[PDB]
Amino acid sequence: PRVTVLVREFEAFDNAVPELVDSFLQQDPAQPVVVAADTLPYPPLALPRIPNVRLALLQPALDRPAAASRPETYVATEFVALVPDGARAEAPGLLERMVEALRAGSARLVAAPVATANPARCLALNVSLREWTARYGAAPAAPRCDALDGDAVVLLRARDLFNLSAPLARPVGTSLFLQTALRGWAVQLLDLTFAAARQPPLATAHARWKAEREGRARRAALLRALGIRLVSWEGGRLEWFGCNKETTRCFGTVVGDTPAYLYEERWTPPCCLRALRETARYVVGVLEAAGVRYWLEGGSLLGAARHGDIIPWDYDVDLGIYLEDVGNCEQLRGAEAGSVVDERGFVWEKAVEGDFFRVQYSESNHLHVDLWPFYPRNGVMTKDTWLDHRQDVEFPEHFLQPLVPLPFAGFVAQAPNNYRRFLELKFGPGVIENPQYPNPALLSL
Amino acid sequence: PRVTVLVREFEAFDNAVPELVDSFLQQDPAQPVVVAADTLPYPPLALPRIPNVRLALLQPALDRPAAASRPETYVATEFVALVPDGARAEAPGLLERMVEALRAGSARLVAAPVATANPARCLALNVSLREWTARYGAAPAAPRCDALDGDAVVLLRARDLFNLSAPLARPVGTSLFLQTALRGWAVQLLDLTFAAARQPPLATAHARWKAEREGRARRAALLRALGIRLVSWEGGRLEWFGCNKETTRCFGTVVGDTPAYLYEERWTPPCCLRALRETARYVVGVLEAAGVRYWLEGGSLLGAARHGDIIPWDYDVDLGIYLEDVGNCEQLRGAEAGSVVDERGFVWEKAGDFFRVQYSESNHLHVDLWPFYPRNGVMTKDTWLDHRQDVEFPEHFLQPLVPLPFAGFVAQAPNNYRRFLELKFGPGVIENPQYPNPALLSL
Amino acid sequence: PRVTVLVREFEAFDNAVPELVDSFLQQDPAQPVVVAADTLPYPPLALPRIPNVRLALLQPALDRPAAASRPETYVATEFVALVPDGARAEAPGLLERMVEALRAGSARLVAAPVATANPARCLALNVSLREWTARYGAAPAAPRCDALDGDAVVLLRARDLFNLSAPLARPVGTSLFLQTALRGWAVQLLDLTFAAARQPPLATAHARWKAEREGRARRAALLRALGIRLVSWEGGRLEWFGCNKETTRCFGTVVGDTPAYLYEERWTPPCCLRALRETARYVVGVLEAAGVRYWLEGGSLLGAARHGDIIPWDYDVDLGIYLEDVGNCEQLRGAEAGSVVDERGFVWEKAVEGDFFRVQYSESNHLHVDLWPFYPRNGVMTKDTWLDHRQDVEFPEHFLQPLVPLPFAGFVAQAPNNYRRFLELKFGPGVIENPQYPNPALLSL
Amino acid sequence: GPRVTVLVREFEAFDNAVPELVDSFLQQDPAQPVVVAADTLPYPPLALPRIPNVRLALLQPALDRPAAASRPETYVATEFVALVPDGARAEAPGLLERMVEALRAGSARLVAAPVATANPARCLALNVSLREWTARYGAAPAAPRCDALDGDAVVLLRARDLFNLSAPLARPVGTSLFLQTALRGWAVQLLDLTFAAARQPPLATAHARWKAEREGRARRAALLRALGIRLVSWEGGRLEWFGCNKETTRCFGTVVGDTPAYLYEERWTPPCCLRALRETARYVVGVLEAAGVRYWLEGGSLLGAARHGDIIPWDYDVDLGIYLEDVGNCEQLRGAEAGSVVDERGFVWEKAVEGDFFRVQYSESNHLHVDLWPFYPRNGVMTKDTWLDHRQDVEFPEHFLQPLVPLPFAGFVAQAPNNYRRFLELKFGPGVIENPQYPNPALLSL
């Protein structure tokens, strides 16, 4: 015996795990079987009390050694077969068939759908940790996959499963293939099918609703724990798991111009980018309706010139405006006498710090558009207040007459004319073609 | 004679860990030092990036192997010293001395106070997983101790620390000694003192208020994760970490008359028992106020007779009442039309031919009320449960009723209640406690 | 007892280091392992990326602190085991047993062979820095050795290894025991054998050949860097690493008559002396066959009188000749017209400075014999030029009438009669019995 | 008690004024700590005063010395270290603590005083990019605050900062010190204090200077190679190269797993290697345009052109597509099928191992190359008979080549498929231009 059946995805209140376990022992009484749980499942499972059937409780406990919560402790065979609840062994010799498939193939995982209502389908999957995004889609090399959707027995070497960081994190159907796809591993969907339980679990609308609410709750906690802020299907059907109008932003107070996600070797969370685009769009719309001359500035102008979007590691949006136009905007003139929360939840405020305005996504989510007011004195756009940035600099007004439409972050914003020049004056030649982080620093990148 | 300094207790927003680490590096530039954190601390700690100083991130990650979060894999030496933030090495050799004490003494752990505003004090500590309770007190054999309260450098063998199930769970001061005391290990509180940092962390009242709040949240999550519902102290102070009026009870629906906690070799969570005793005292009060004749029944009577309280694995309270006084109680009158939530949050229902009073709308810990009526001097009812002890009984057992301490108050019980309990449960029931369904699980 | 495995001796292009590391991890998953290299090995070593296995790069780097290239900072354990490529921990607890022998014995190093085609041998070793010589032999008190030859696991305290000046210079088999034997330390060769790799490295004849080539290059660079000119073995076999006919001599131009090696508290390099003795022999043979009367002069005669050889810190060879005889010698005849390279590559020249001749070992190697022509005036040998040496004096011709045989540099040379009186006349009384450096006012014995 | 250790590292053994240097500092304070550092014992002898505060630090390994003997911090007991070049002399008393006081009261971690030689220190700007293997020098925008110095200066900094560098005394210190300090974001303040020149300066003849300069340039070239600086520039120009060229091998060995060695070193392609690829691309394009072979930028080269008009900074070759029916118009290509062909300009044209493609190597020794992939139109889809394990090696509609479009690339104008943006996304996926990635992300990520 070289395969250990391991059952992780089931619900204590309604399962067919005893039928599952029995079905395998009917084919081999010596079959190693591990049912894994965080706490002792209740009502009792009453699995057969034989040495090859073991219940693995994986949460830490005051009375148990460190090994007791490590799943590899309970597996002494070369391969592990992850079996979902609802499956049943009916035809004999099917785990051996799966081993021979995995031996002969080039994929580190092999899988056989279970004949449930939701049998496994083959999926493509890329994990971008820099972008906190998991991108799913149809599998162009089926039956060679990056991930599975639905019910399948998945077999792989124990050494591969248990060297992952979160081998049994729930839902397995999500956490396993996120880890295996990131490592460039593939799973081969075999033309073998496991039968379904004769008494399938969760066979009522109410039990299914309970299971799905808990399943979705575990998935949401799993993606947040692992830094997946966004799930997409074919670039759409977007599923968010980050910040929003009602939460704080994902990273909070930046020190040394280097936000926390850079030290995590990632870029700006996509929920944060989404909020910045929406605030930029809203603020631009407000200034255009009020008759405020604005133009993309600093990193926003640079990002618009390079790829027409926010630079993917940047953390705010900066606009220049004519200072004499400020009185035209109600939120702005309100923001010079104190903090203003407008009809749509955006907070307009004048950070007395550097003599500029700041518009935050909401009272709790402090992703902001900074507005830098400019006034001409002897033909140059210049303010008697600056900060320690190379690109906080005076510039001749002719860059602003006329202004130019430039795509930026989903809409068309205004830019200085000859913006390519303009950007080279402020950042240096070749800046559009040579990306950079905001402050190297005594470390990496 | 090699010892790794291991730092776990610090706040990312306000810490003195750079000074801590640099102070040890002053005594030995190659001192092995491990800073452990769940997530990457920000603002950056900006530790010296030298091979002997390492940052151990303990949470799972899509792009790291299982080993990357296992702390023993960062520690190669025989001994480890847990150093709290705010501490510092000044005089040389203090770790070597603590090693010397460990090898000469008999305690598996040695410790040295840090001269902060909360230097470590010695405490006794008794852990009862079966009762979800940890009990602290003053240490009779100090400086031999079960646990510590306050700041100390703790040194032990790495094989000892890392074979624990949760060696670095926060707060370490709570988590560590719960696990070591449960094993019968002692900590010896040595005479050595570590100096405090010169620029101590949490210097403003605002900052320590933040730290203590987040410290309190971590401790509550820790105790819930590891099955401590109650912390008690000599002197009577009680710290609750379980259910209450606004939560669910701690255990789900009971199958086979055998609750989930018994299969975990544990008894009723002490918070659930507290709720039951509170519901018992309230319902009794309402019934006496309304003039309803009640007596303790079933397991409540048994526990009252045996030790004047709820049987420690029991999960409800049972009272008999006279059929005919039901109408005297407003809540009971209403409970027959439908579910009544009275002014104190209790939920009166009828459903069975008995009444049920639940602690609250969310907490379904309940007192069951069993109405009986006399037929021929025999107390009877019209529907029956599949319980040996659910039977008719002579009414003279109610004529009269006797005062009996139960669950903190004086209840009413049948006269000759030991004979009463023997009639329903069988002989010797008081002296021979048994789980509710020994066919499934027996005590 | 905690022990860090430290791997230094391997080749990037062909090794069994992953197998080595893996085999120790199979006995303790948290085994601390340090792989040391001067540059990042490419192709990638692909060690398990786990915190207890670390790669230490011993190169300077602009973005790393001093500590990153100092290997002691990677070793936290009391003990360290140097393990060569091609070895494996197959038996549980071999390092522990090596640790116990170290504490029980008196040797600072303990060693275990590995069952390769060349398991470690026990050797004696004396190091003489002053003579630039390392002398190996059979070990008189085996299993206690000064040095090993072949593959072994070598265990010692980290404090002892990393207090050495060059703990990990390659080849470690040579470098380590030069340093430990010079310090009087012993290495006890235990009766413990580590296994060889299942796939040993260098399975082909081409890579086995390419490894020996880089090894010998590393070995020669090591001994030159450390000042070992000569390695000898019982059996007489000699390995040289200094002068030859085709290179320059080891030391540059001598100022103050005090060569650079003397200031380093060493004597003349053994290759330089060898060249001088072969040049003296050759020149004597030329002058004798030419019928040129010659005699041992200056420091050569003094050395001959003391012990029949060159003074061990001396840097040339001196012979006096009769001036009227130079025309008898073909090489001397051409030398007056210009530089002459003769049948054996020796270079005969008439010196710029003082009316004397000089014979260089070769065109590139300027170790030389100086020929001092004298002529008789009134029974007194004289010349028209004079050095600022006290022993550069006239002398009576009867000292040359006749000459006496005197062994020098492996052959029999002609010397003045009464050479004791001759030497004392030129150097002052007691010179034979009182060795002194050529310029005691700058550097004395 | 003195708080500065004078440290002398830049001098020549055959010709120096280090004895005069040491004596001048001892004349202001006879107890002044003075360290002279060398790899080997300097010969002729320096014959420094045999007092305990004057020490020779030999920084090479030795069979009879402890580890500490070759570490420079072993020789310094003071908080501060003054790096003093040969040719300086202390005549004004107390200058060393004016430098200590200036460094304490300022914000630069280094301060420096010029030495009044013929080459007095000038303030410089310096940007070090390890990823691009480049050191960019220029005029200092915020003088007297600098990133680097050129010329002779006493440089004072804390021992803890100097000796925590990886190569604190690597020669030339004028190069190695500031490459390390500028990489860390440290500044050096050129103070308004002057040190006097040696009364009898070293290297006073042309021949002595010529020997010193040849040795110095050899140490500088070895230093830059060891430290991974392939290119030095002054104001973007005056390029100075220390990498590969036409006569050497390329900088990185044979690539395995599509991931060259420089990626594992957390670096991008060496700039010498990129230069050779741009030269070979321009040459090969020039040859094919002259011979009448239709070509187009392909693969990573087309992708780099569309994004920023150059080779992608971590890419290792250039790929062009050609019409197979045009191969016969190029002499070098028709010879490539029969065997390897070195053309008159040193480029090597070969037909592939298997793969039915052509490879043009920069030179016989330097195997950076332009790969040429020929296709032909089956039913209007361009195809080849064999394929690669890469995602982007597929067929494509022929209309993407009727017409071809100009596109700037690598310093010249090359031909691209029309609508190259859509062409790129079909082969690589949507958004490829706006989202850059590495060749094998599962092994090594950007």
Ligand SMILES: *[C@@H]1O[C@H](CO)[C@@H](O)[C@H](O)[C@H]1NC(C)=O
């Ligand atoms: C995943 O990434 C690959 C990159 O090779 C790309 O070709 C593929 O289309 C991507 N799939 C999704 C669904 O984004």
Ligand SMILES: *[C@@H]1O[C@H](CO)[C@@H](O)[C@H](O)[C@H]1NC(C)=O
């Ligand atoms: C992780 O991989 C190593 C190498 O195969 C293996 O020996 C080890 O047992 C694996 N770990 C677990 C927990 O399975």
Ligand SMILES: *[C@@H]1O[C@H](CO)[C@@H](O)[C@H](O)[C@H]1NC(C)=O
């Ligand atoms: C722990 O149990 C002992 C009896 O063994 C008891 O005396 C002690 O008081 C308990 N500990 C505490 C803190 O109550």
Ligand SMILES: *[C@@H]1O[C@H](CO)[C@@H](O)[C@H](O)[C@H]1NC(C)=O
């Ligand atoms: C647990 O203890 C054993 C025996 O001392 C030891 O071998 C093992 O390494 C320990 N586990 C750790 C340190 O994680």
Ligand SMILES: *[C@@H]1O[C@H](CO)[C@@H](O)[C@H](O)[C@H]1NC(C)=O
């Ligand atoms: C080493 O020196 C000892 C003592 O002088 C001597 O007895 C022995 O022969 C020497 N061994 C070798 C190999 O030269």
Ligand SMILES: *[C@@H]1O[C@H](CO)[C@@H](O)[C@H](O)[C@H]1NC(C)=O
């Ligand atoms: C050198 O030995 C001493 C013991 O005297 C020890 O303290 C020190 O750590 C050692 N140095 C190194 C680099 O191991």
Ligand SMILES: *[C@@H]1O[C@H](CO)[C@@H](O)[C@H](O)[C@H]1NC(C)=O
């Ligand atoms: C160095 O980098 C800065 C910041 O990008 C730039 O402004 C400056 O021009 C650069 N200087 C040189 C000489 O490259």
Ligand SMILES: *[C@@H]1O[C@H](CO)[C@@H](O)[C@H](O)[C@H]1NC(C)=O
């Ligand atoms: C590096 O700096 C620390 C102070 O931060 C100092 O203790 C240490 O000695 C320094 N290292 C060296 C080699 O000078």
Ligand SMILES: [Ba+2]
């Ligand atoms: Ba910006």
Ligand SMILES: [Ba+2]
């Ligand atoms: Ba009960």
Ligand SMILES: [Ba+2]
């Ligand atoms: Ba001589």
Ligand SMILES: [Ba+2]
């Ligand atoms: Ba390419």
Ligand SMILES: [Zn+2]
């Ligand atoms: Zn966000």
Ligand SMILES: [Zn+2]
């Ligand atoms: Zn409770």
Ligand SMILES: [Zn+2]
């Ligand atoms: Zn020699």
Ligand SMILES: [Zn+2]
């Ligand atoms: Zn190159």
